[PDB]
Ligand binder design. Structure first.
Ligand SMILES: CO[C@H]1O[C@H](CO)[C@@H](O)[C@H](O)[C@@H]1O
Ligand SMILES: CO[C@H]1O[C@H](CO)[C@@H](O)[C@H](O)[C@@H]1O
Ligand SMILES: [Ca+2]
Ligand SMILES: [Ca+2]
Ligand SMILES: [Ca+2]
Ligand SMILES: [Ca+2]
Ligand SMILES: [Cl-]
Lengths: 111, 112
């Protein structure tokens, strides 16, 4: 896997469109090593290709596969506000669930 | 090593540049036959390369204004037809053609 980060922030829908444009997908860390690689390419909080949109508290990648490795920040995922179904990788490498409508950088993944 | 990825949609050069730069990459510029073939592997149709003779006609440079060495022009190219062809695309046979920068083609981005 190759990981590339965007320079501008955008909502999840636009983030997916960007990675898909070059035939990749939004980065989904499968272990601690990939998590670090993605963190390093991201210069700020960035979207990961994980959501619990289909079923609340059931986090899966953009292809519907349930995720095994997780690296949630203490207190997360909390689904606050009116709901948070998308996921971002914080600058310390931990994860936070956020509104998919909010704007963040995006790290795309390619094979 | 360099990694090459092709776009799904067609767009003019300036948009092609913006797309590759969005992920901090550049428009693919083959420096030898091996790279030219690697770009061929990912491009399913005619695609832009990061080369232009915008500064001086018939003097080809990469997008950073660095004059290129390796070229793989299709027979009869570059011909600067009509109002002018200052951008370059990789044909489906691996050879190159100069085309109008305002015309739309797929784009192959390069990363390292
Ligand atoms: O509110 C914000 O902060 C809390 C943690 O303090 C997060 O859970 C939430 O997603 C927002 O980022
Ligand atoms: C007629 O113009 C088109 O075809 C010629 C070759 O026939 C190319 O040189 C040119 O860039 C266009 O693609
Ligand atoms: Ca949720
Ligand atoms: Ca949260
Ligand atoms: Ca020309
Ligand atoms: Ca031509
Ligand atoms: Cl949401």
């Amino acid at each position: 896997k190759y990981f590339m980060s965007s320079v501008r922030r955008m909502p999840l829908n636009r983030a997916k469109a960007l990675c898909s444009e070059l035939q990749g997908t939004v980065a989904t860390p499968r272990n601690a090593e990939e998590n670090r690689a993605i963190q390093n390419v991201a210069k700020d909080v960035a979207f990961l290709g994980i959501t619990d949109q289909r079923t609340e508290n059931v986090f899966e990648d953009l292809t519907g596969n349930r995720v095994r490795y997780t690296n949630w920040n203490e207190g997360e995922p909390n689904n606050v506000g009116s709901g948070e179904n998308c996921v971002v990788l914080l600058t310390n490498g931990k994860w936070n669930d956020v509104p998919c409508s909010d704007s963040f950088l995006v790290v795309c993944e390619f094979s």
